[PDB]
Amino acid sequence: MLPAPKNLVVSEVTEDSLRLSWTAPDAAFDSFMIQYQESEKVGEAINLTVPGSERSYDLTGLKPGTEYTVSIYGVKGGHRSNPLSAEFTTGGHH
Numbered sequence: 001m002l003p004a005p006k007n008l009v010v011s012e013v014t015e016d017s018l019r020l021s022w023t024a025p026d027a028a029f030d031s032f033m034i035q036y037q038e039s040e041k042v043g044e045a046i047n048l049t050v051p052g053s054e055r056s057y058d059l060t061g062l063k064p065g066t067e068y069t070v071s072i073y074g075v076k077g078g079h080r081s082n083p084l085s086a087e088f089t090t091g092g093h094h
Contacts, residue, residue: 001080001081001082002074002076002079002080002081002082003028003074003081003082004073004074004081004082004083004084005022005023005024005029005032005072005073005074005081005084006022006023006024006084007022007023008020008021008022008070008072008084008085008086009021009022009086010086010088012058013088013089013090013091014090014091015062015064015065015090015091015092016060016061016062016063016064016090017058017059017060017061017062017090018058018059018062018068018088018090019056019057019058019059020034020056020057020058020059020070020072020088021055021056021057022055022056022072022084023055024055024074027052028052028074028076029052029074029075029076029081030051030052030075030076030077031049031050031051031052031074031075032049032050032051032052032054032072032073032074032075033047033048033049033072033073033074033075033080034047034048034049034050034057034059034070034071034072035047035048035070035071035072036048036059036068036069036070036071037068037069038063038066038067038068038069039067039068039069039087040067052074052075052076062090063090063094064090064091064092064093064094065089065090065091065092065093065094066089066090066094067087067088067089067090068087068088068089068090069085069086069087070085070086070087070088071083071084071085071086072084072085
């Protein structure tokens with residue numbers, strides 16, 4: 001498949017939000033797909049798209065002390081890359 005984005009990380013962690021960042025070559029993708037869901041849930045995944053020029057995304061509307069499974073894939077004119085996944089946890093108590 002297409003080469004996946006690399007090194008998904010998190011910063012600016014709050015009780016209800018997270019900044020996601022990743023790496024990818026310039027002009028590789030026209031967009032990225034971002035999927036996230038509480039790690040223990042199924043069938044409740046939320047999907048977002050961002051422009052291919054982006055390397056960070058501010059995720060909001062989250063719950064405190066909650067672990068989220070986040071995956072991103074790169075898309076170039078329709079075809080998607082391998083997924084890149086991580087488990088990030090918000091601050092506070094569950």
